[PDB]
Symmetry: D2
Subunit: 407 residues, 4 copies
Amino acid sequence: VQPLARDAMAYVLAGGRGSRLKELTDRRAKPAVYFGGKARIIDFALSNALNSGIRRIGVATQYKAHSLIRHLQRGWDFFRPERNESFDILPATQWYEGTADAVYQNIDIIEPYAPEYMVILAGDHIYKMDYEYMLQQHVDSGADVTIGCLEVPRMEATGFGVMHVNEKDEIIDFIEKPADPPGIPGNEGFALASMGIYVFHTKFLMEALRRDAADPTSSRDFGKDIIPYIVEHGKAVAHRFADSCVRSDFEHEPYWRDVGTIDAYWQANIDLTDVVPDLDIYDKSWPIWTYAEITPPAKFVHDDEDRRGSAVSSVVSGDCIISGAALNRSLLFTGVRANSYSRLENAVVLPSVKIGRHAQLSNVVIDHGVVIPEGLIVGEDPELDAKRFRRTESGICLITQSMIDKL
Amino acid sequence: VQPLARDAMAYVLAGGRGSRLKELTDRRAKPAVYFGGKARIIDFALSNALNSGIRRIGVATQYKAHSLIRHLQRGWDFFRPERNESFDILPASQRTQWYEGTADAVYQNIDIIEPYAPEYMVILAGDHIYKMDYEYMLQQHVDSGADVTIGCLEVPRMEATGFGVMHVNEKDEIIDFIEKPADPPGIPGNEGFALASMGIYVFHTKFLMEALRRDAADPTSSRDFGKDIIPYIVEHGKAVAHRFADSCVRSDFEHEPYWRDVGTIDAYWQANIDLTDVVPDLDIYDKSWPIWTYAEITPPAKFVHDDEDRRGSAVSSVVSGDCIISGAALNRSLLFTGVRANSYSRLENAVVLPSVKIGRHAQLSNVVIDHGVVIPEGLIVGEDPELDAKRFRRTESGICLITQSMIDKLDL
Amino acid sequence: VQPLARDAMAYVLAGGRGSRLKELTDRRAKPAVYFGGKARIIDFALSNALNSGIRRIGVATQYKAHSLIRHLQRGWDFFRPERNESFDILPASQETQWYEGTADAVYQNIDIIEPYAPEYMVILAGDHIYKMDYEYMLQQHVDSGADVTIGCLEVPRMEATGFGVMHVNEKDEIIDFIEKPADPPGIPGNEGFALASMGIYVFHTKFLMEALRRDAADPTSSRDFGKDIIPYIVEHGKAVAHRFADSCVRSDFEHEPYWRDVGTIDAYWQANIDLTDVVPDLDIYDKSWPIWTYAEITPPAKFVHDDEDRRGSAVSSVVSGDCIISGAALNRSLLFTGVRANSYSRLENAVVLPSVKIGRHAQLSNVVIDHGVVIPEGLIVGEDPELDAKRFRRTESGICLITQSMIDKLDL
Amino acid sequence: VQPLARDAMAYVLAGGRGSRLKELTDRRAKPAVYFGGKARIIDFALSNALNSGIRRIGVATQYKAHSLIRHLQRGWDFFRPERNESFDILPAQTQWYEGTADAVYQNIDIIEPYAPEYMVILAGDHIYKMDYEYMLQQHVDSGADVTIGCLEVPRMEATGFGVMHVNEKDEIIDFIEKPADPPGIPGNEGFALASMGIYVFHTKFLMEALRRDAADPTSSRDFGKDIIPYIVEHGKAVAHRFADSCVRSDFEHEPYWRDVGTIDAYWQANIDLTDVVPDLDIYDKSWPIWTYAEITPPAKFVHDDEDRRGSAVSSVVSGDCIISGAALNRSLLFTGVRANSYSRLENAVVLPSVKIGRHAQLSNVVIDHGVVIPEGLIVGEDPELDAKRFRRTESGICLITQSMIDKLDL
Ligand SMILES: CCOC(=O)C(C)=O
Ligand SMILES: CCOC(=O)C(C)=O
């Protein structure tokens, strides 16, 4: 009768470096990377927790955590312990020694709350999911551990940690990036790919992490140490994302993105410019809370022979002034100033960027606050572009202020 | 050394009906009228008080006040009394027996004011759009020894005819007060201008309390500052004028001191649509004197479709969050939060209030569209003046105000 | 799988006058009355809604709602609509509009409710003190297929005479409703007990809007849930009782399910003073079902003087913040925030509301002192029944309610 | 006309170890130490900033700053940048701060976007009330490079201070660390100016000064030892008298400033709040001290028979305290303290959530946060049994921590 969420604590692992994002994550953690025009990546796991009815949240951070922590302080500031809500920011010769460690080192903060269930979450994915489903499967299945999994074509699973299960979705082995991924019994050509989401009873986990602290062998991670141990010595069960996913009617399939490369990151944002986007950012039934300030509305100015400030097939945030600049298939975060005779196409423009007059840019991700010099051309000369900026094989240039200065 | 604002309470009169705004205020007070894409009118006086360092605010409401009051409860909710801040929402009888006037609006609330014991009271009109630093006006008030300091616009005399006008001597001491003078008295030194009352009054609090008690005890008083309290002091006390230009907070992108009454639909339309200029008279992108309001986290603005027949786009326009511009042409328009403009529609010279829906093929020009209106598909406005005058409120200059009740009546 | 509370709106009827509480409610509505040292009565229904996971709450107020509305504005200010949460304060007057009854209180505000489109409405009285998890009642409602679920106390029949009583069958289906039955029908199989309505009702929103629109067009209706809406469904539709015992959130340290009307001065006094017990019926130190309220940061409680003639200390008492007990003796008393009790004074069996000041040498016994009352030096209460009755509101059991207007008229 | 606080930013140095406070700062920085019953020491500087009209605040922290950082996030969370308000918590994002100067230098990246005119450098480990608008007004007028807040102290007590030589217009002509013969004030000998560690700068000037300091690989990167000694000698340093800006309540007999540097001083400043006429008026609503506070139940006193009586005399007691058959005298209790039957506290400062077991009897103590006092424990009866059981000062105050109690089998 009583929702299990009332007795759950969501614990967000937010230390992921986002290595392959290169300069995008040079001074910010992957979960602090901007997404969608208004939010950051971590706001999704956090909003899922909130919307699922989980009132206690812990967030473990590791490297380059400064701006991630300031985001959390500014945006996620409305929890009060007298309402049995909490939001603890838990930063790391003093780092965490893995994903399991960050729970272990913080037991003293967890146990006063004494939650019945722990919902361990990866904070660097973009998805919407109602965790109450997973909680209910967990208590009703008697599992030691319930693991959230995507169903992906066997070929795609080769990059995931893959769970080998049986006909009752109990997990019988785990393999990191199996090159020939174990298929679902009775449904080959599909594999169960781990989402980095783990539901525990709280007391089992506590011991499970104590045990891990003691063992010299352990790399102190959930994926390699905690879980496989459980898989081999206890009862592990799979939960399928399709069962819990909160998809809008206007989302043609369950949405989940890792945005683990500049290409995947650029594509995921630019896809929001579609007539029918994969992600329905207008689904008010499952809203994404974030840090946002009061801003002026977007402004478009100039319209004559040679210049017209306008956006077409584009998404534009507040505090943006589009002055004689032509935008197409671009997403602009808050605060962008684009000036006369400049042009943007296939552009993901992060907060507070200035585009100088006459600049022309195509297929780019422009980093936070970058000032684009007047006249710069990107997307015309693949080879000059690759020398000046971080350019992908697909031809997306990631542009940072450091890159511009060296011009 | 100490700023006087620490010792002041701002008391905002927010019962303005905005009668000439017609259907725009049939269900809301004038201070609750939307402006500029995000805020409401009352947010300017409150942001002035905040930015000036005043920590205690009272707001007296009168007619049609629920949405104003809701706005205040939700947007102005961050003042804490044990930090010596306060924000009091004060409707007629206890959050018949209406306020009998603006002075009554204070008098009835003496028991709210007195516990705070502020040293000064700043009486504000909540129905004007303007930026002002009240600390200068406080300074002048104590340093001049006046009974009342009155905020005054310095306007050419032909404009002052619709204002309450203060007559000036050499030292800017007010020597009489005229309500809407046919030929306004001028300022000594430079004739050609007049001092028009802003409805801003600074008192020593104790002085003010005695006045409103005296006004309450006068059986022939109409119970207003403008008509009753102020004329009494101008004569039998010391009234002094403060010049708006001296306290006005101008951005360096604002060519002149900005103050707007938006007392008519043309004025309302004109003040909003002027924000679409390359160089508007009001700088809303300024940060050195910010306007706080009630704002919700919204998805960004979206523009879509780009084919032969339809292009979602905004030109020389201002567009807010949660707007979806789908195959619709926007030109010289101001869109508030939550507008959904649909394929093949067109908007020119439009002020479009929150949550409006523009149906496919609809074409609207020179309009103000009320909050939440659902424009039916294919509707045409701005083309047939007599038909346009027939179904909607239409001004002499050709502006159409459109409400849902007007749309509901549509069959011809 | 999905908790029904996500889909419910709580609607709190906070218009109780508390007539029998006499002077205690001469300027405040009953839901605004102080309870327990810090909170107000309305905070129990609101905290129940919040703890049950209901994110949308409306409060309908009626008479003397000034201080109630103020409390709700400052205390219950943390709901944000973009997180699908909302807190609407819905005063009977945007004067002329008064709600015609508890049913009119909803009907007039349909245009506040339907935009949120909740699936369930939970109608609550805002003037009782109790803890209850409404998810239990929601589930029963959807499982039972009923048109209304009604929350009911299980009370011994001779105490049931004072209540609105539902007749019940073996399936807890309500076959009749009786207002104050001289002989309350017992529960089948459990005579000796009867079901008393708590004035708590769960509906599907679509059904409730239907019923409310039917009621408004019926000119004979008293427009109340109690007299009109519920009895109509009882005879013509499907009403089922829900047992408070099943939903009540009882602490380990509460010997039974706790519910209190505090309808009389004696009952009010009794319910507060009971908190000074070694083992109170109400466990306020519970953290598993917390009661939220408006609270300010205050200094701690202070106890001073210990000489031969005066000692400030409290025995068998509960004392809040900002209290200074200066050479004063407290015994079996409950003090709200900001009480100043001065040298040589004594309080016994006293419920003392916020900001009360107790003058030197005063000695008060068996009292309720209203908010902000200054007790003059040397006043004696609880010594002479006839004198105390002449001066104050004295109950049959000898409880004196003391208000400042009673003190003002005094001099023996 | 325009108050200078509008253009100022307060930067609070909150990395003090409070080394002499021993186990009381075992796992927390000094600014995080509880004071007065409901607040922490850092809240005083912060409330001074806010009350003075300084709506931009940064806090630099160093060692053991977890609870300090949590307190700040929870309690000081009401600033919004779009109202030109900001509160930045700046932990050491290797590379600890090199000193209080380095604490500023690393965070130029945080400061410049706000571009304030003035920087008000504040020690976050003192208890005092001050209106910084006076010191700002003096600084801009004096035309000096740095203005330094100073206590006026009798020279006999100035020997334990950083003392500023002054001339007849309060220009600082020397700074001496703990002078044996502290230089006296011109025409007011017998009083010396003792630095409060409060400095006012122009922001541009301070950025240069901290950039120069960072370049010198020799420097100890501290305002006290490096930057301030450089300005007196080569630039323009001027003193600001605490008495000139202190916010002294009518019920405060003298300007109040406390360092609470030692266990005895900490105990003394807290227990002094139980006085009939305390030196610190914690009721002056005119200059209020904001902190992190939760809604809690009122304090409760229960039991009253021949053998036990729950009550407090000459005491200060917070919310969520249950005094159950326990007798308190001259004690200050923070939130959530449970004292059980037949127990007795005297001259006791008891930090939050402490449990006092039945029959326990304690005198002259500071009990650390959350400590559970075993039933029947006696402290303050036997000085030598106490000094080996707990940390006991020369004056006879016992600091009791949980790790000390856990060692008990004598
Ligand atoms: C807060 C941002 O508001 C906006 O004006 C848009 C366009 O998103
Ligand atoms: C805010 C907590 O207040 C109290 O209950 C006491 C006694 O300080």
